[PDB]
């Protein structure tokens, strides 16, 4: 039970994956919603490339690091792979 | 002091303790007049003995006065003895569980709503932090009590 | 099945249907002439609330769906001091 | 006891028709009901509902009297009006302690509804709910001390059924939930601390409201049982967390939020 956030430049996905699972499950559940093939999508997480289906833990996100309070921002890239151009959220106004 | 605490008279107990009596001395098995005050449900005697530092010590059966009070369905005495500044979580929840269990099978004090509520209160006290969670030492099932292997979760409770 | 939660900045915040339905006016927006009964977009328009308050609201959706019965283990939801008084009005408007 | 009840009721009616103070009469009459309860005898419903109507009328008259009167008479009227409120509480405890028919229960609920919508307040600001859950609510040394015990899980459920303002506040801002959490007998009385907390919470008590010193109900809890039991029933909401973060960070919430939300940040 670890909660992940898959962020493109504009869109954003909030998903959940089991601890005893691999990257294949999340690849399938992000292919199902975004209708894009798994080979085109790349989990460009923290300016680092990842693998396809080896291990959840070595990717970089764990149960403690990724929480529903603030999940880790996992980027997404598609083949043209594209560069990381994740548009940040709007800056809140400065409180007095 | 032991027989005075066992009876319903507290003036004699107060007079005895007012001249530095022995509220820590042991009786035949283990009683220190706390195990006798917490047997018939005399809350004032327990309060007086606790005030003059009667101390908490197991009896010959390994029963603290809190556990003796819980065994006899004395909710008042359990409430008083659960506030002692040294009670420990394991003893607090086992006293609450024993009180809830004792309310289930008794004649003078038979309440099944109190049984469920005290068992649930001790269950929620076990499962509140997640970290350093207190887990129940479930005994193997006994054929006499049907085949129920205790209730170590709030869902089954 | 999945609700695309647009923002005032154009950000898409696709979350689960059960996660978004914890809000009140999200369910009110989805019901009525806004079903789009093909479970492909389920878009709802937010032309008044910025992207960061959507980030907080969706994170709260995951937080509430995950944490519904866990005694006092309930972790503290982190609110930035600048993003409060904007998450407050957003949670009022969403009946969250 | 039937003849005594009838004679007392006739005397109370005669005194009420003459526009005279009846707080002592109502108090003695409730003492008579409590004494009759302590003897385990069947209780009539019509006299209960009639004295409930008389008590709500007397409390309204007491409010009318204290609205404008001299200072010594202000103290006398406040004392008599608080005594009338306590006697109404004892009468509600008596009513919920005995068995009544459907129409009689409906009439009793109507009388309690009328008094609740009258909104009575003591010196400290305790409504009918803040007194039915207060262990410091005084009980008369007579037979009322035998059956009228507060907090009571049956008076509170009756007041919630008749629609008492659950989130009402005292002069210190304490809700009806800031008072039951600090109960001093949680383990001994885990039936009026549970059936009240689980009643106020499901009746719409904000289990995060801050009193005048900014203390939530689980922050105003003097025992660990209430904290355990309140945190079970409490439900999370982003409007509560965001308002709590606004109040904690000392953000200016004046005219930057809806008018109905300036009250929400007022107590959350």
């Amino acid at each position: 039970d670890v909660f992940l956030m898959i962020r493109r430049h504009k869109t954003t996905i909030f998903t959940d994956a089991k601890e005893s699972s691999t990257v294949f499950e999340l690849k399938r559940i992000v292919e199902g919603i975004l209708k894009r093939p798994p080979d085109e999508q790349r989990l460009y997480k923290d300016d680092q490339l990842l693998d396809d289906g080896k291990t959840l833990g070595e990717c970089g996100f764990t149960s403690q690091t990724a929480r529903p309070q603030a999940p880790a921002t996992v980027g997404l890239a598609f083949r043209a792979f594209e560069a990381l151009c994740i548009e940040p959220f709007s800056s809140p106004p400065e409180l007095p | 002091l032991m027989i005075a605490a066992y009876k319903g008279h507290t003036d004699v107990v107060r007079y005895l303790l007012e001249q530095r009596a022995d509220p820590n001395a042991k009786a035949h098995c283990g009683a220190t007049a706390l195990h006798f005050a917490a047997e018939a449900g005399h809350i004032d005697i327990v309060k007086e003995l606790i005030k003059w530092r009667a101390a908490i010590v197991v009896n010959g059966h390994g029963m603290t006065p809190l556990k003796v009070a819980a065994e006899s369905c004395k909710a008042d005495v359990v409430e008083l003895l659960l506030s002692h500044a040294d009670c420990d979580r394991r003893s607090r929840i086992e006293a609450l569980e024993l009180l809830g269990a004792s309310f289930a099978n008794d004649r003078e004090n038979y309440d099944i709503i109190k049984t469920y509520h005290y068992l649930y209160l001790a269950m929620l006290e076990r499962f509140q932090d997640g970290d350093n969670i207190l887990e129940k030492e479930v005994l193997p099932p006994i054929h006499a009590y049907g085949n129920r292997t205790e209730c170590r979760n709030p869902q089954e409770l | 099945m999945y609700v695309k939660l647009i923002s005032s900045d154009g950000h898409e915040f696709i979350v689960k249907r059960e996660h978004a339905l914890t809000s009140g006016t999200i369910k009110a927006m989805l019901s009525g002439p806004g079903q789009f009964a093909e479970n492909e977009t389920n878009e709802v328009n937010f032309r008044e609330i910025p992207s960061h308050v959507l980030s907080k609201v969706c994170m709260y959706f995951t937080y509430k769906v995950r944490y519904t019965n866990s005694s006092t283990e309930i972790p503290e939801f982190p609110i930035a001091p600048e993003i409060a008084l904007e998450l407050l009005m957003a949670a009022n408007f969403l009946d969250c | 006891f039937e003849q005594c009840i009838k004679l007392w009721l006739h005397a109370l009616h005669l005194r009420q028709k003459g526009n005279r103070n009846t707080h002592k009469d109502l108090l003695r009459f409730a003492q008579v009901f409590s004494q009759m309860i302590h003897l385990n005898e069947t209780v009539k419903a019509p006299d209960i509902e009639c004295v409930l109507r008389c008590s709500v009328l007397e409390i309204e008259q007491s409010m009318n009297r204290v609205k404008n009167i001299s200072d010594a008479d202000v103290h006398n009227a406040m004392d008599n009006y608080e005594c009338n409120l306590y006697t109404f509480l004892y009468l509600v405890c008596i009513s919920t302690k005995t068995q009544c028919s459907e129409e009689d229960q409906c009439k009793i609920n109507k009388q309690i509804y009328n008094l609740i919508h009258l909104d009575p307040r003591t010196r400290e600001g305790f409504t009918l709910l803040h007194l039915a859950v207060n262990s410091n609510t005084p009980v008369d040394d007579f037979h009322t001390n035998d059956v009228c015990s507060f907090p009571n899980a049956l008076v509170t459920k009756l007041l919630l059924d008749c629609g008492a303002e659950v989130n009402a506040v005292d002069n210190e801002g304490n809700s009806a939930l800031h008072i039951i959490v600090q109960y001093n007998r949680p383990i001994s009385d885990f039936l009026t601390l549970h059936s009240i907390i689980i009643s106020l919470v499901e009746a719409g008590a904000h289990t995060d409201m801050t009193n005048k010193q900014n203390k939530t109900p689980l922050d105003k809890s003097t025992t660990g049982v209430s904290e355990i039991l309140l945190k079970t029933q409490m439900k999370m909401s982003l409007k509560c967390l965001a308002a709590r973060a606004v109040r904690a960070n000392d953000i200016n919430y004046q005219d930057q939020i809806p008018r109905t939300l300036e009250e929400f940040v007022g107590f959350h």
Side-chain angles (χ1 to χ4, degrees):
Chain A
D1 43 356
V2 56
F3 281 70
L4 276 299
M5 187 254 269
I6 295 98
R7 204 166 160 214
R8 203 97 188 285
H9 44 85
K10 292 301 279 291
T11 192
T12 301
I13 313 296
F14 289 84
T15 54
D16 168 41
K18 194 54 73 176
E19 294 173 352
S20 70
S21 287
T22 75
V23 182
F24 182 80
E25 287 95 314
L26 62 84
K27 285 283 275 297
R28 276 302 176 278
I29 71 189
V30 76
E31 162 196 9
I33 174 63
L34 268 172
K35 81 197 178 295
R36 292 276 84 78
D39 56 348
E40 186 170 4
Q41 63 190 10
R42 294 285 294 113
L43 303 165
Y44 198 75
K45 166 192 176 70
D46 293 333
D47 206 46
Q48 182 177 0
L49 274 79
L50 291 184
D51 44 2
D52 213 321
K54 266 180 62 181
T55 302
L56 277 187
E58 57 92 31
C59 284
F61 60 91
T62 58
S63 166
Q64 301 306 104
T65 48
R67 274 283 93 186
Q69 295 84 245
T73 307
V74 171
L76 207 73
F78 287 163
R79 309 185 289 108
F81 313 113
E82 86 194 55
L84 203 63
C85 203
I86 314 294
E87 184 168 352
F89 306 131
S90 168
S91 76
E94 295 87 8
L95 73 165
Chain B
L1 190 59
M2 322 287 170
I3 185 54
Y6 181 68
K7 295 308 287 181
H9 319 276
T10 186
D11 45 355
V12 285
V13 179
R14 194 177 324 117
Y15 180 48
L16 259 63
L17 56 85
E18 265 172 345
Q19 58 184 358
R20 303 185 71 255
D22 57 356
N24 205 32
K26 316 293 283 311
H28 193 199
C29 304
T32 65
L34 273 181
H35 306 73
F36 279 125
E39 188 179 358
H42 300 132
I43 185 75
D44 52 357
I45 310 182
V46 182
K47 195 176 309 176
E48 284 168 354
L49 291 174
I50 285 297
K51 177 164 166 202
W52 272 263
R53 299 305 103 82
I56 293 302
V57 56
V58 297
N59 60 2
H61 313 289
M63 300 266 293
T64 58
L66 171 64
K67 222 198 282 192
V68 177
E71 197 273 312
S72 45
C73 306
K74 303 309 175 192
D76 297 322
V77 189
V78 174
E79 173 214 1
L80 194 140
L81 291 169
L82 278 180
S83 71
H84 197 271
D86 44 356
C87 202
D88 205 359
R89 272 197 64 185
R90 60 174 300 279
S91 183
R92 182 163 217 282
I93 296 89
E94 68 181 1
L96 290 178
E97 284 172 353
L98 187 51
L99 190 44
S102 299
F103 271 119
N105 295 291
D106 204 340
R107 212 158 57 252
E108 295 89 4
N109 317 113
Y110 167 68
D111 271 321
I112 207 66
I113 44 169
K114 294 191 102 164
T115 293
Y116 169 67
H117 282 169
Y118 281 111
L119 282 189
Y120 198 49
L121 160 69
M123 196 64 53
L124 294 178
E125 206 153 347
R126 281 184 186 275
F127 306 152
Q128 60 172 318
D129 293 337
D131 192 15
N132 59 91
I133 178 171
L134 194 44
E135 198 64 35
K136 201 181 291 198
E137 51 273 15
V138 169
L139 285 199
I142 306 163
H143 183 40
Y145 318 124
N147 213 0
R148 291 177 181 81
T149 180
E150 183 60 26
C151 281
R152 73 276 189 192
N153 277 328
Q155 297 90 45
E156 40 196 356
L157 186 44
Chain C
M1 186 60 202
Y2 272 66
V3 190
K4 180 194 290 289
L5 296 174
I6 207 70
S7 160
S8 179
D9 304 330
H11 288 65
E12 286 95 17
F13 279 97
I14 302 161
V15 304
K16 209 178 265 158
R17 176 73 168 253
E18 192 188 307
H19 286 224
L21 285 182
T22 81
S23 167
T25 70
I26 289 291
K27 176 158 49 187
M29 273 156 161
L30 291 184
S31 84
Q35 293 90 17
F36 280 174
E38 286 87 7
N39 50 74
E40 89 278 25
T41 43
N42 264 309
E43 195 180 311
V44 291
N45 197 49
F46 285 140
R47 68 143 180 88
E48 291 178 352
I49 60 187
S51 51
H52 41 269
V53 302
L54 267 298
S55 171
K56 295 292 183 182
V57 166
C58 300
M59 284 186 292
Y60 170 72
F61 285 157
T62 51
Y63 168 92
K64 184 182 213 304
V65 168
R66 198 257 166 276
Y67 300 109
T68 185
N69 46 2
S70 67
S71 78
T72 76
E73 197 268 331
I74 301 299
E76 297 87 12
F77 201 77
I79 317 293
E82 59 262 4
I83 210 163
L85 205 77
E86 281 181 344
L87 187 52
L88 164 73
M89 304 188 294
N92 189 179
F93 166 66
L94 296 183
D95 278 338
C96 205
Chain D
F1 265 121
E2 313 281 316
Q3 277 76 72
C4 202
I5 284 294
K6 287 163 163 166
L7 262 69
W8 273 93
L9 203 69
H10 180 63
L12 179 57
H13 281 130
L14 285 178
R15 203 88 72 85
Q16 174 82 4
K17 292 306 185 297
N19 203 3
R20 279 255 74 89
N21 210 350
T22 42
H23 70 285
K24 284 301 208 312
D25 200 359
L26 288 163
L27 185 143
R28 277 194 298 275
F29 196 63
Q31 285 165 345
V32 164
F33 292 105
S34 176
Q35 181 180 350
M36 188 258 285
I37 289 290
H38 200 194
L39 303 190
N40 299 265
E41 204 261 325
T42 303
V43 191
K44 297 184 295 193
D47 54 339
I48 293 297
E49 62 209 7
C50 184
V51 71
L52 279 168
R53 199 206 298 111
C54 187
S55 72
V56 307
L57 288 165
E58 181 49 53
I59 290 183
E60 206 276 335
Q61 205 53 253
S62 298
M63 263 186 275
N64 215 345
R65 292 151 186 191
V66 65
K67 258 187 270 193
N68 45 1
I69 212 69
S70 175
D71 51 348
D73 219 350
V74 162
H75 299 95
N76 187 22
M78 277 311 287
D79 208 350
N80 296 326
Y81 160 54
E82 289 153 55
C83 283
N84 277 120
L85 212 44
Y86 298 145
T87 55
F88 177 79
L89 283 158
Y90 308 146
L91 289 178
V92 170
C93 194
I94 293 292
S95 158
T96 191
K97 190 54 64 70
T98 184
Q99 184 76 37
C100 295
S101 77
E102 172 72 26
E103 58 267 13
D104 300 327
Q105 192 69 267
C106 283
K107 212 270 186 181
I108 285 154
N109 286 23
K110 183 58 66 183
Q111 289 311 311
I112 296 174
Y113 189 98
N114 288 326
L115 191 43
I116 275 169
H117 276 251
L118 206 50
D119 200 33
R121 298 270 176 171
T122 64
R123 275 187 194 97
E124 207 61 38
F126 299 127
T127 180
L128 278 172
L129 203 51
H130 305 165
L131 285 172
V133 308
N134 217 353
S135 82
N136 295 352
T137 291
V139 193
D140 204 75
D141 45 13
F142 263 72
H143 321 87
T144 51
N145 207 3
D146 289 355
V147 72
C148 301
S149 71
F150 294 141
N152 189 358
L154 304 167
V155 180
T156 297
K157 193 41 173 193
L158 208 43
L159 297 177
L160 298 184
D161 266 358
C162 301
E165 189 65 33
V166 176
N167 289 282
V169 288
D170 300 332
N171 289 328
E172 208 65 32
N174 286 353
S175 178
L177 203 59
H178 291 78
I179 281 167
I180 191 56
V181 289
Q182 49 198 8
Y183 195 21
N184 45 357
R185 320 200 298 136
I187 297 102
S188 167
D189 217 354
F190 199 72
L191 288 182
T192 192
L193 189 140
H194 181 38
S195 294
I196 284 179
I197 278 181
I198 210 166
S199 278
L200 299 175
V201 162
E202 74 184 3
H206 273 166
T207 68
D208 204 72
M209 173 188 290
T210 64
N211 44 5
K212 266 193 178 44
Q213 51 260 14
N214 272 349
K215 300 193 102 200
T216 70
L218 73 163
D219 204 7
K220 209 67 196 304
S221 172
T222 62
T223 185
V225 168
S226 295
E227 280 200 15
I228 285 155
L229 185 60
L230 176 57
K231 262 180 293 198
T232 297
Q233 283 307 303
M234 73 160 43
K235 288 150 270 270
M236 62 198 71
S237 292
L238 190 51
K239 198 155 50 157
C240 311
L241 314 178
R244 220 186 299 147
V246 161
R247 279 284 263 193
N249 299 336
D250 271 352
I251 318 172
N252 286 314
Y253 61 98
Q254 294 301 116
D255 308 310
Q256 285 98 24
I257 48 167
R259 189 58 53 163
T260 177
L261 214 51
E262 298 206 334
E263 302 149 40
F264 198 93
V265 192
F267 51 77
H268 264 269

